[PDB]
Amino acid sequence: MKLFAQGTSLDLSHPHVMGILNVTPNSLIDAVKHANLMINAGATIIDVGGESTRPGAAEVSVEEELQRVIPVVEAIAQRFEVWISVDTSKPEVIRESAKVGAHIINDIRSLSEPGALEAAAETGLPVCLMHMQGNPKTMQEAPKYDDVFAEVNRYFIEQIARCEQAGIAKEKLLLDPGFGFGKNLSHNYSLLARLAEFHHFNLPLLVGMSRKSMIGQLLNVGPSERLSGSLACAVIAAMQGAHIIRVHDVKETVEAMRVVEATLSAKENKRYE
Amino acid sequence: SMKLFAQGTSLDLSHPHVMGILNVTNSLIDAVKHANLMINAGATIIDVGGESTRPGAAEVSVEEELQRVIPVVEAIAQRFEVWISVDTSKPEVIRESAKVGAHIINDIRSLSEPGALEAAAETGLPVCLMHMQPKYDDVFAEVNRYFIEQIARCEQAGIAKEKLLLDPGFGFGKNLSHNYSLLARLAEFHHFNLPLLVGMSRKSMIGQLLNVGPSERLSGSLACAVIAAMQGAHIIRVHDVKETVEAMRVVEATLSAKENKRYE
Ligand SMILES: CNC(=O)CSc1nc2c(=O)[nH]c(N)nc2[nH]1
Numbered sequence: 001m002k003l004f005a006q007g008t009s010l011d012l013s014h015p016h017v018m019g020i021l022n023v024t025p026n027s028l029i030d031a032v033k034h035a036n037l038m039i040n041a042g043a044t045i046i047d048v049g050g051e052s053t054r055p056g057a058a059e060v061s062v063e064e065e066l067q068r069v070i071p072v073v074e075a076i077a078q079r080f081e082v083w084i085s086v087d088t089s090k091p092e093v094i095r096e097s098a099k100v101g102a103h104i105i106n107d108i109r110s111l112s113e114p115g116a117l118e119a120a121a122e123t124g125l126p127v128c129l130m131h132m133q134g135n136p137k138t139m140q141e142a143p144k145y146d147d148v149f150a151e152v153n154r155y156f157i158e159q160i161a162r163c164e165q166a167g168i169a170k171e172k173l174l175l176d177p178g179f180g181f182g183k184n185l186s187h188n189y190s191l192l193a194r195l196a197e198f199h200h201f202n203l204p205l206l207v208g209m210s211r212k213s214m215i216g217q218l219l220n221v222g223p224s225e226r227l228s229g230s231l232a233c234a235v236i237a238a239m240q241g242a243h244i245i246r247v248h249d250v251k252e253t254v255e256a257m258r259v260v261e262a263t264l265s266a267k268e269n270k271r272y273e
Numbered sequence: 274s275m276k277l278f279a280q281g282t283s284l285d286l287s288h289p290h291v292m293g294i295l296n297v298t299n300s301l302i303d304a305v306k307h308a309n310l311m312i313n314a315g316a317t318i319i320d321v322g323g324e325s326t327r328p329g330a331a332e333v334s335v336e337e338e339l340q341r342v343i344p345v346v347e348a349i350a351q352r353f354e355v356w357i358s359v360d361t362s363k364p365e366v367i368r369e370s371a372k373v374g375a376h377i378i379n380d381i382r383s384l385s386e387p388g389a390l391e392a393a394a395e396t397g398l399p400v401c402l403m404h405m406q407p408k409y410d411d412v413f414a415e416v417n418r419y420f421i422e423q424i425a426r427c428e429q430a431g432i433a434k435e436k437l438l439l440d441p442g443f444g445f446g447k448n449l450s451h452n453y454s455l456l457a458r459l460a461e462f463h464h465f466n467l468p469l470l471v472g473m474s475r476k477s478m479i480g481q482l483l484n485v486g487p488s489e490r491l492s493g494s495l496a497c498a499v500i501a502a503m504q505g506a507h508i509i510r511v512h513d514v515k516e517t518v519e520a521m522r523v524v525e526a527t528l529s530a531k532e533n534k535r536y537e
């Protein structure tokens with residue numbers, strides 16, 4: 001299983017760590033320095049995000065997002081060999097990012113914005129499709145499912161169809177159940193517990209649980225006290241064959257993933273279920 | 274539903290338990306303070322031994338081992354509700370430990386010293402059977418065969434199967450690939466229908482993989498603990514209790530959301 005972009009490939013025969021590079025508010029210098037620490041810690045993908053997708057967040061203008069994100073994507077693509085995912089919903093950010101070297105479009109809205117689907121298709125880049133109920137402004141008010149796994153799974157069916165029909169080949173797609181995006185605690189753990197069952201699509205799985213409420217609410221601790229919980233989440237996901245793990249704490253996660261890889265390669269079928 | 278019974282209390286093995294490692298080196302005050310810290314971090318068992326009971330540590334006389342071990346076990350038993358695991362191979366220490374409140378006999382030698390088997394049987398206490406001998410044809414099958422034999426050996430000495438715990442003994446005459454093969458197939462040891470205990474904390478199976486020293490192995494230790502607990506391991510022996518307890522609560526939330534309650 002591989003992805004292809006900007007004349008390189010990403011080998012998904014083992015898990016990859018994706019370092020989080022938040023550029024919501026010298027910012028260019030610091031971002032490049034942070035990217036560098038994460039690369040040295042073993043991150044093979046950097047996720048550059050210029051719009052807060054947190055519960056309650058206000059939208060960011062196209063002009064603000066471009067200014068925050070494009071110089072950062074460019075600088076990294078110029079200096080390092082690492083892959084770059086862009087955490088955006090905007091057609092113009094999608095277009096400009098591809099032009100300065102981004103490898104993956106990571107859209108929490110699964111290209112739902114007017115023009116986003118067509119822009120993503122024109123770039124030819126890999127596209128991550130994430131599940132969210134509602135939108136970031138109200139998703140966490142009262143998340144509700146009869147069956148969270150089935151509803152997330154149905155959603156991936158439809159979005160894969162939607163993408164294929166715009167001329168995005170299945171082989172460019174990644175799936176992400178969207179931990180925290182319109183989900184209470186028990187919804188999140190139902191998804192994590194059944195994560196291996198999303199392999200039926202035969203597509204890369206991407207997960208982001210790092211320092212999120214599904215850890216905080218379980219342990220009753222703030223964002224800075226969540227590393228152990230985050231590693232546990234990462235290991236649980238990678239033990240079930242998750243291909244990319246989106247995290248804040250790269251070094252610790254990479255060490256944990258090495259242990260998982262040694263375990264999985266000793267196994268005769270290469271995955272837990 | 275799995276439970277152990279000892280010293281008028283019980284251990285509920287429907288979820289995983291973190292066992293904290295206690296170094297025995299006044300020293301009694303310090304041991305109790307360290308027990309307190311691990312209990313407050315959420316350990317429900319304390320394993321009395323640590324550095325002094327590691328492989329290669331200096332052997333001690335019966336008299337010395339009683340003087341260092343018995344007062345510690347007694348002190349914890351008087352002050353806390355926590356279960357107490359005792360690291361010993363000597364029948365006298367097994368006997369005296371039981372008299373002052375120990376709950377589990379954790380002998381890395383599987384009661385092989387003269388009299389140790391008979392002493393453990395007289396206590397009525399739970400006993401951990403750990404594999405130790407690196408070369409194997411099939412490391413899992415050798416370890417598995419070893420459990421069959423030690424289970425029988427204990428049953429024959431009058432120790433009921435319900436008092437036994439099984440430990441594959443990570444790092445004990447095992448190279449890196451042997452250790453990871455055991456960890457990869459840990460769930461298969463559930464066919465004995467006995468508790469599984471594992472100890473990977475800060476071991477060379479992490480140090481050699483990551484190429485880091487003993488104080489830099491927390492992330493790998495946590496990964497190992499999570500991998501074992503996701504496969505239904507019941508007791509996890511560790512140095513870093515708080516962090517392990519936190520990882521275990523994540524594992525519990527995950528296993529509670531599953532219909533099957535274990536990964537394989
Ligand atoms: C502290 N919370 C955050 O980091 C929220 S931002 C964010 N989360 C995710 C995620 O779970 N998956 C993907 N693909 N992209 C994401 N972007």
Ligand SMILES: CNC(=O)CSc1nc2c(=O)[nH]c(N)nc2[nH]1
Binds near residue numbers: 476
């Ligand atoms: C840094 N190395 C150590 O902690 C070696 S001492 C030790 N290991 C184990 C183990 O794996 N299982 C049990 N039951 N008892 C043990 N005692």
